[PDB]
Design a protein around this ligand. Structure first.
Ligand SMILES: Cc1ncc(COP(=O)(O)O)c(CN[C@@H](Cc2ccccc2)C(=O)O)c1O
Ligand SMILES: *Cc1c(COP(=O)(O)O)cnc(C)c1O
Ligand SMILES: N[C@@H](Cc1ccccc1)C(=O)O
Lengths: 353, 353
């Protein structure tokens, strides 16, 4: 006899990290490459003084700062904070979907959507992509009476691509207005080529749109775990009901506030990443690789059954990239010397095939 | 029209941030009063250098340190880590209970038990205490075909009491073996008078027992959010399947490992708390208050309908204590001069009744 656990746990699609290759160049986690600004370390140092005290559960000053950052139409009541946007992903399922309810998203997409939906006893509706891109028409066709939540990942992880900004608006307009739609905008700060949607305009115009963002990437605080959701006050209130209390640390909040104060400098750095992304993409395509147009801080290599081998051999060259089954490899765009090292590996590996 | 959210959210509380008055004495969150040791600050400071990188999702070094700390009977496979033990409480519900299922606990007890159970669509079976203590017999009598999880909070929050250590073993031996039992031991470090149960021994002897502990109180890291569970490897594996990835921060892991290195010093400090707890209890009893025997870092005042008034008047005197409905007030034992300020207020308040 053992402790009886839920049958849903059986072969639950777990998030598995990449194995650590000591000293390897880290192109597997979509991290930016710079340590904290002086003002961010100072805020962290000051917050370290009171590590014996619980954080502000309501993240009051952080919400105020976020609403200010967001603009005049946004107040603290429109903002929920979570322990990474990954926590907010689960909170969205928890406020919308239970047993038998359906959650729709393009697939392949963020690897945590399926397990988080399954943990709730809900049914993941995984809609195939075309041109490695969310197919909004196919997703809409997939809606039923049991649909309680839709995830639009934009840019998409792991395929790197974006939908058209007006297409997104038409999609939102077409979805029954009582179904919550979450636009996961983890890489929104890297979009260029006039493809960035009117994210805030959409939440202003639609009560059922919620936008998710993160401090982990462009704002460089992946280690400290701060994400936020922007939406209608009733949606925000619900997210905070299921929020596990105190999960956003005091150091996290302090660092996040200091980072918003330095947004202009931090956002400006994304230009350099975009330039390197364009260069890495061009050189890969020149060497014979196929990949879609990226609007994030990584590219997607649909290598199929060669995925495992690519990633194993990269690891032999002290380079860590992220495999996805037998679909493809996601490679983060990092510092120029690091990207060149990846490129030398890629060209050699290609020639050998 | 608004987004349709789960109706079960009506069973969950909204918290609303109360006043944050400068100079108020903080006796409402069960916190210890000392800031970080030099070695803990150093761990935090060094992990800050790489805040742009994600944490170790598997908390490998922290689990190894916990397994050491636990001794030769326990390996990393017996340990799950969570973003505070509050996160692990939810994870326990997620591996055991869904719609229709029953979760048993004493009541009044940890304020998070009911909402976390409601979130899963499960039903909380709230069993009345006897003399402000868990009634283990009454709890056993409430067990049914639908019972998937039992919480025993020991010491109990908010009533401060423990069950007999031998009685706890008898109860565990008597519970049907397929039912997971969680022993919440957030205040275990404060138990004295021969009342500490053989917590680890219960884990070793029963596949269905899990123990929850925290770095928030005795180890003084409430701000950083690290809890842990000790259990059978298959239960631990399950907890880690529903674990929200990267929620335990890099700074949190670094700080916890360093605190474990300083366990002797940190644990030695609990003796002073216990001395204050006894003094506070005696002084309250001389003033005419009746309270049960505490084994935590707080005392419980069963003031019934007078609790709201007590707490409000304390707040006017710049003292923060925690109300629990019309049941009672939980008062943290902290620095002697804070405790004296509280006692002066309590004495005045009582003589005014
Ligand atoms: C599309 C998308 N949404 C959310 C998140 C989570 O970011 P957070 O704000 O929680 O740091 C990501 C991030 N993806 C990375 C890292 C990761 C984090 C949690 C779980 C799995 C992976 C990745 O490697 O996929 C994202 O892309
Ligand atoms: C304080 C407390 C905890 C610990 O919470 P953390 O999330 O570890 O800070 C757990 N359980 C109970 C009943 C408590 O009172
Ligand atoms: N989350 C509640 C209750 C709580 C207190 C302490 C720990 C966990 C939960 C609060 O704001 O205080």
């Amino acid at each position: 006899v053992t402790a009886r656990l839920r049958p849903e746990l059986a072969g639950l699609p777990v998030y598995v990290p990449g194995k650590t290759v000591p000293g390897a160049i880290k192109l597997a986690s979509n991290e930016t490459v710079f340590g904290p600004l002086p003002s961010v370390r100072a805020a962290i140092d000051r917050a370290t003084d009171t590590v014996n005290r619980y954080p502000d559960n309501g993240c009051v000053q952080l919400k105020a700062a976020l609403a200010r950052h967001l603009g005049p139409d946004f107040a603290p009541e429109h903002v929920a904070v979570g322990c990474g946007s990954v926590s907010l992903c689960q909170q969205l399922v928890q406020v919308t979907a239970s047993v038998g309810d359906e959650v729709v998203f393009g697939w392949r997409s963020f690897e945590l959507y399926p397990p988080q939906v399954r943990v709730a006893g809900a049914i993941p509706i995984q809609v195939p992509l075309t041109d490695h891109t969310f197919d909004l028409y196919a997703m809409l066709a997939t809606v039923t009476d049991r649909t309680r939540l839709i995830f639009v990942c934009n840019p998409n992880n792991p395929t790197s691509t974006v939908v058209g900004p007006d297409a997104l608006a038409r999609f939102v307009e077409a979805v029954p207005a009582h179904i919550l739609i979450a636009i996961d905008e983890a890489y929104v700060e890297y979009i260029r080529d006039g493809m960035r949607p009117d994210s805030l305009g959409l939440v202003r115009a639609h009560n059922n749109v919620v936008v998710l963002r993160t401090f982990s990437k462009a704002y460089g605080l992946a280690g400290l775990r701060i994400g936020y959701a922007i939406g209608h006050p009733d949606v925000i209130t619900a997210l905070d009901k299921v929020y596990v209390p105190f999960t956003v640390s005091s150091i996290g909040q302090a660092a996040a506030i200091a980072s918003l104060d330095a947004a202009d400098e931090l956002l400006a750095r994304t230009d350099t990443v975009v330039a390197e992304r364009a260069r890495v993409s061009a050189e890969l395509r020149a060497a014979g690789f196929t990949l879609p147009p990226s609007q994030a801080n990584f590219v997607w290599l649909p290598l199929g059954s060669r995925t495992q081998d690519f990633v194993e051999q990269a690891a032999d060259a002290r380079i860590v990239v992220r495999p996805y089954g037998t679909d493809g490899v996601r490679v983060t765009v990092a510092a120029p010397e690091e990207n060149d090292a990846f490129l030398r590996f890629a060209r050699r590996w290609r020639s050998d095939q």
